[PDB]
Symmetry: C3
Subunit: 96 residues, 3 copies
């Protein structure tokens, strides 16, 4: 640690006094997990908005074929081929 | 691909022009994951409604024993035995 | 099973009559998964409230460094060291 930064943080540990072991365990779990969970939600919200706004959802339902194949069908075809999927989305790789 | 179906889809790739690599990565992640996530939510909503409406929740809380064992206790007993659990629910297998 | 407890439960299986195999599969999935999911939500709500109420969020954003390091940065440093993280939170282990 940078001692000057520790000097800012160390005093804030007093704010956790009186919490139970269970509370501190939950807090530690949260500290370890929240950043990835928040990032994934942010990215998925961005994706969902694009998918609806650009018109994709008009032909692609999650689990039923309509005008186009379901997203289940698409996901099956591109399982383990995300690089190729991105290339398809960019117009660089033809449809499978 | 069916060329006649490609003729419908290929033009829609123009709707993704101007999006960043990060946006396209999020979109691809979404395409790969959403169908399973949507199906699991749909199924879990169906299950939760049955569980409450049929009266199960009156005797079975998630993590505390009341009239009957907690769902944690039940899940422990049936861990790796979902086929047997379904048979129990149907009246075909006696309680453990 | 305790026969006296089976006598309470067995009759309630009549409440599942007329449900499809798919409905019963969803119900069994729910029975197997809900207790852990409910416990984890309860714990994470407790943690989130502590984190905000005690002032931690004023210096620790999820994915950007501000006054203090991001929670992503913290999680990286403490990956596989949750015991040490808890000890740090208690004032027992110095910062890394
Ligand atoms: C909005 C920009 C989108 C996105 C992200 C996708 N589509 Fe479509 N699509 C349609 C049809 C008839 C097909 C089958 C033909 C084919 O497979 O190319 C498709 C297919 C796809 C795929 C799979 C590509 C592959 O390798 O097979 C993907 C990833 C995909 N789409 C994404 C039909 C339509 C529409 C009907 C008018 C509209 C609108 C869209 N698609 C829009 C999008
Ligand atoms: C609503 C239809 C439900 C569902 C899906 C379940 N129950 Fe009960 N239950 C009760 C008691 C006292 C016991 C212990 C006796 C026993 O174990 O059989 C149970 C047990 C269960 C189990 C576990 C079965 C096993 O193998 O042990 C399962 C899967 C289960 N229940 C599901 C008591 C009650 C009630 C009190 C009046 C009511 C209502 C229900 N149960 C309803 C349901
Ligand atoms: C509210 C009680 C909290 C909790 C749970 C944490 N902090 Fe902070 N913190 C700050 C600075 C400048 C640093 C860097 C110095 C250092 O690393 O010690 C930190 C660091 C942490 C860590 C990492 C500990 C380590 O081993 O490096 C953890 C787990 C942590 N914090 C938790 C700055 C601040 C504040 C600015 C005034 C406030 C308020 C907090 N922190 C509050 C908390």
């Amino acid at each position: 640690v940078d001692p000057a930064k520790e000097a800012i943080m160390k005093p804030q540990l007093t704010m956790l006094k009186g919490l139970s072991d269970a509370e501190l365990k939950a807090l530690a779990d949260f500290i370890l997990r929240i950043a990835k969970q928040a990032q994934e939600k942010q990215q998925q919200d961005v994706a969902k908005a694009i998918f609806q706004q650009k018109g994709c959802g008009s032909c692609h339902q999650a689990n039923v074929d309509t005008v186009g194949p379901s997203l289940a069908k698409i996901a099956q075809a591109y399982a383990g081929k995300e690089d190729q999927l991105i290339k398809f989305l960019k117009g660089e790789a033809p449809a499978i």
